[PDB]
Scaffold this active site. Sequence first.
Site, PDB file in Angstrom:
ATOM      1  N   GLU A 190      18.298 -55.116  25.068  1.00  0.00           N
ATOM      2  CA  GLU A 190      17.767 -53.851  25.526  1.00  0.00           C
ATOM      3  C   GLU A 190      18.741 -52.701  25.323  1.00  0.00           C
ATOM      4  O   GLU A 190      18.354 -51.646  24.843  1.00  0.00           O
ATOM      5  CB  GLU A 190      17.386 -53.919  27.001  1.00  0.00           C
ATOM      6  N   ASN A 238      10.368 -42.465  24.493  1.00  0.00           N
ATOM      7  CA  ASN A 238       9.184 -43.007  23.847  1.00  0.00           C
ATOM      8  C   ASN A 238       8.228 -41.851  23.608  1.00  0.00           C
ATOM      9  O   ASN A 238       7.460 -41.455  24.488  1.00  0.00           O
ATOM     10  CB  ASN A 238       8.544 -44.071  24.731  1.00  0.00           C
ATOM     11  N   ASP A 267       4.215 -42.099  24.480  1.00  0.00           N
ATOM     12  CA  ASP A 267       3.686 -41.919  25.825  1.00  0.00           C
ATOM     13  C   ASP A 267       4.494 -41.018  26.749  1.00  0.00           C
ATOM     14  O   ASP A 267       4.209 -40.952  27.938  1.00  0.00           O
ATOM     15  CB  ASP A 267       3.408 -43.270  26.493  1.00  0.00           C
ATOM     16  N   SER A 304       7.486 -41.287  28.031  1.00  0.00           N
ATOM     17  CA  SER A 304       8.276 -41.921  29.081  1.00  0.00           C
ATOM     18  C   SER A 304       9.644 -42.177  28.471  1.00  0.00           C
ATOM     19  O   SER A 304       9.792 -42.085  27.251  1.00  0.00           O
ATOM     20  CB  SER A 304       7.618 -43.229  29.548  1.00  0.00           C
ATOM     21  N   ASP A 318      13.270 -44.798  28.733  1.00  0.00           N
ATOM     22  CA  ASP A 318      13.862 -46.059  29.183  1.00  0.00           C
ATOM     23  C   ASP A 318      15.312 -45.771  29.553  1.00  0.00           C
ATOM     24  O   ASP A 318      16.043 -45.180  28.762  1.00  0.00           O
ATOM     25  CB  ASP A 318      13.810 -47.077  28.045  1.00  0.00           C
ATOM     26  N   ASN A 372      11.832 -48.372  32.479  1.00  0.00           N
ATOM     27  CA  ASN A 372      10.920 -47.277  32.137  1.00  0.00           C
ATOM     28  C   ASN A 372      10.547 -46.317  33.266  1.00  0.00           C
ATOM     29  O   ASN A 372      10.190 -46.740  34.380  1.00  0.00           O
ATOM     30  CB  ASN A 372       9.663 -47.879  31.487  1.00  0.00           C
TER      31      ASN A 372
END
Length: 130
Positions: free
Chosen positions: A35, A46, A49, A51, A53, A60
């Site tokens: 990750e 992202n 959408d 959002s 991380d 998220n």
Amino acid sequence: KVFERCELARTLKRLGMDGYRGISLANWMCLAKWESGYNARATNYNAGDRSTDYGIFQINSRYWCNDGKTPGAVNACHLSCSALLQDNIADAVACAKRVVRDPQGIRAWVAWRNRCQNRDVRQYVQGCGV
Ligand code: NA
């Protein structure tokens, strides 16, 4: 801060992650590795959408932390996403424990399915003394 493999392993063990909800320490190490490359200040936007991380486990903003700019989002961990970027990972760990407490478990992260599930993950903790 970018953690070294064994340093992170011992830190997670001290924070009570070994076997949390049936998830072994080597699985958490595998997740962190893929990750963020063990980078506590990692962030990834992202575009699709809107959002973002955050941190070592790339949690998220739509469901777990509040960053104020994510549309129709919630804050299940009840934390500012800023908290997930600290060198001290206690808050990120507490929030990751909350994430897996959901039905999906460790499967909530697609990267875990892609590179950890059904693989030999012992390499992640070998020689760390955990
Ligand atoms: Na949120």
